[PDB]
Structures are given as structure tokens and as C-alpha cells.
């Protein structure tokens, strides 16, 4: 992805905090360096081609310094629950055609004017129970959706039985009626699906949607047959795919700009952030004011990333070494 900057953005990867220079030997180490009077601050980081010392931060000229606990960057996959409401009818009316119009948006487009629609249809019967309706609607949902042989589908359709109430039965296009043997289905769950992601060409995007209903008639009036309520998400997307795209852009504010354009003749810039782990972020945003005529500030920022083991340990060791050497008070998370 491409981002917006305040005239620069420099990113450095923190894999292991050594104590000082001549201890940085492996690729990805870092040590925050400062002087004894706490005037300037810079990060000596080991690039895989040698020690690369960062831009010197004048400590009187810092706007903010804040860190991110790496759970504030995880996207939550929204879940909708499709139930027959007790206001209209708790049982399927024996003659009515139940059509569920999923109203997707932003599909293979960038705007909300690129809208897509997928469906699911079950016409009820005389001895139609409510639990067999949620079994038959989800299979008919898994035929209009979930049929993409080429790519992974738009949404994930689940079924929760009332005897379990916390474990969802997966419904796919291979699933027939005989595979779902429970008799106590009470809802259908339409979860979002993590879209494909390649490093530096396609960003992490999502296709939002809203399950919409078509009108059935019960007492001679056209009523909406079900309700679509959003429950709290249970499956999240980790931080590996956003941070690796952030290193892809802010390594071009320091090094190679031609990131695979003339394909045989490129400069292969090795990337240090791997997409298979979550990553904390620490940001330091500062400026530079010159002497006697050049009072204008050339604002800058320095981004540090460290691997998160859940307990925020590797970032807290990095903030704990900056606050000692530089003297700033960054909030340890």
C-alpha cells in the first residue's frame, strides 16, 4: 500500500536490542543512542548490508512519541446472525418464498458504487420446522455463494445448533442436507473473509456487506421475514500483512525506489519484517528548525517495529531503553 506522509517516513525493524555498538552482528538488531546531556537521539540499526545509523532526533524538537500495542491494528471480521424474528412468525409460513438478498459493496472496485448481490432461496412447506429452515437456507446460501473454483469466497456461512450455542457448524458447497444432522439450528452466521494479500502490490482490503431480506406475507401484509443483527466478532486478522506493507513503502524513503520495475535490472532490497507474525509499532515524530533565516520546520518521523509475543515484552524493552538514554517518557504498554 501507499500511505500519506509528513514529508518523510522512515521505518526500522527491531529484532533484538543489543546493548551498544560492536554488539550488533546479526541483521535486524537496534540500539537507541544518545549523548550524556540528552541533546540528540538516533537508532543504530543493523541492516543486512552493514550498520545503518538513523536520522538524529533533536530532543527539544519532538512533537509526539507514542506506541501501538499491536492489537489496535488487527481487523475484526464482522458477523451477522440471520434469525426468523418472533414479531412476524417464529415458524416458516407454509406457502411463502423466503429470499435472502446479501447486499455486498466495494467488490473488485474501489468505491461503494461497485455493488454485488448474492442470494439464498427456500420456499417453505407445510411441516416446515424452523430448524430445518436454517439448515436448508444455509445450503442454498452455499450454492449461490461458495462456488468460486478460482478464488476463496466472499463470506463464510456457519450454522449454530442450540445444544452447542458456541461452536459453529461450517456450511460449504459440498455440504448436503444429510451432513447436518442436528435438529436445533436457530441462526445462520455470515462471517467476513480475509481477502488475498501480496507484498507491495495489493493491499489488505475487505468486502463489506449487509444481509437484506425480501418481503413475505403473513396476515395479508408484506413483512420482512428475518432480522440481521451484528454480534461481536470472534475471528480477527493479525498484524502481519499491514506492517510488511508499511516496510515496503518506508524502505523506499531511504533506499531503492524502483521496486521491481525494470525486472532483470533491479536492486533486490531485502525486507526484514515477515508477514507471519504480529508486530508492535512505536512512532517518533519530530522536526528541524534552522538558524537565523530558515525557521521553517522540515517535519520527519521515525517508525520502529518489534515482534509481539502477546505480552508486549519486546516493545517494552525497546521503550525502556529509549526512556533511559533519551529521557523521553513514552507510555509503556
Amino acid at each position: 500500500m501507499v500511505i500519506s506522509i509528513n514529508q518523510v517516513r522512515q521505518l526500522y525493524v527491531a529484532k533484538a536490542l543489543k546493548a551498544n555498538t560492536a554488539a550488533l552482528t546479526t541483521a535486524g538488531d537496534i540500539v537507541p543512542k544518545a549523548d550524556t546531556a540528552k541533546t540528540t537521539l538516533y537508532f543504530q540499526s543493523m541492516s543486512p548490508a552493514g550498520i545503518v545509523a538513523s536520522d538524529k532526533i533533536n530532543l527539544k524538537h519532538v512533537l509526539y512519541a507514542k506506541a501501538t500495542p499491536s492489537e489496535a491494528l488487527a481487523h475484526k471480521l464482522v458477523r451477522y446472525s440471520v434469525t426468523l424474528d418472533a414479531d412476524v412468525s417464529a415458524t416458516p409460513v407454509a406457502g411463502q418464498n423466503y429470499i435472502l438478498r446479501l447486499a455486498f459493496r466495494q467488490y473488485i472496485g474501489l468505491s461503494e458504487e461497485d455493488q454485488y448481490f448474492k442470494y439464498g432461496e427456500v420456499i417453505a412447506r407445510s411441516g416446515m420446522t424452523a430448524s430445518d429452515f436454517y439448515k436448508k437456507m444455509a445450503i442454498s446460501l452455499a450454492k449461490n455463494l461458495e462456488n468460486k473454483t478460482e478464488s476463496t469466497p466472499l463470506v463464510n456461512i456457519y450454522l449454530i445448533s442450540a445444544a452447542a450455542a458456541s461452536t459453529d457448524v461450517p456450511v460449504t458447497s459440498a455440504t448436503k442436507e444429510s451432513d447436518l444432522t442436528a435438529t436445533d439450528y436457530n441462526q445462520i452466521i455470515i462471517e467476513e473473509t480475509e481477502q488475498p494479500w501480496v507484498l507491495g502490490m495489493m493491499p489488505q482490503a475487505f468486502i463489506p456487506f449487509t444481509p437484506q431480506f425480501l418481503t413475505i406475507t403473513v396476515d395479508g401484509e408484506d413483512r420482512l421475514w428475518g432480522v440481521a443483527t451484528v454480534v461481536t466478532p470472534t475471528k480477527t486478522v493479525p498484524d502481519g500483512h499491514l506492517i510488511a506493507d508499511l516496510e515496503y513503502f518506508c524502505m523506499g524513503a531511504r533506499g531503492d525506489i524502483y521496486r521491481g520495475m525494470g525486472y532483470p535490472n533491479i536492486i533486490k532490497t531485502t525486507y526484514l519484517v515477515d508477514p507471519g507474525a504480529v508486530y508492535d509499532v512505536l512512532d517518533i515524530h519530530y522536526f528541524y528548525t534552522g538558524s537565523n533565516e530558515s525557521v521553517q520546520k522540515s517535519e520527519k518521523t521515525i517508525t520502529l517495529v518489534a515482534v509481539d509475543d502477546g505480552s508486549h515484552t519486546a516493545m517494552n524493552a525497546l521503550i525502556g531503553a529509549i526512556n533511559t538514554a533519551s529521557g523521553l517518557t513514552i507510555a509503556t504498554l
Binding site: 407454509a94 406475507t217 403473513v218 395479508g220
Partner: protein
């Protein structure tokens, strides 16, 4: 005062302005629901 011109035999709810004739019931629309005679 409320005219119903036609009668529809159906296993479904036919229309608000018609008589619903099932096998042994004669339902018609009254006060927001189908009132059976007899």
C-alpha cells in the same frame, strides 16, 4: 360498505380483498387478520 367481488380457493393467503376458501373453512380479512365463519 367493504365490497369483496371475488373468491379465491388456495392453500396460501390469496389476497386481502378476496375470500380465502380452504377445504372446510371460509376466512376473510377483518381487523388485520383472517376471521373464520361458522
Amino acid at each position: 360498505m367493504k365490497t369483496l367481488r371475488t373468491l379465491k380457493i388456495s392453500p396460501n393467503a390469496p389476497d386481502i380483498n378476496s375470500v380465502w376458501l380452504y377445504k372446510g373453512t371460509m376466512k376473510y380479512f377483518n381487523n388485520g387478520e383472517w376471521e373464520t365463519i361458522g
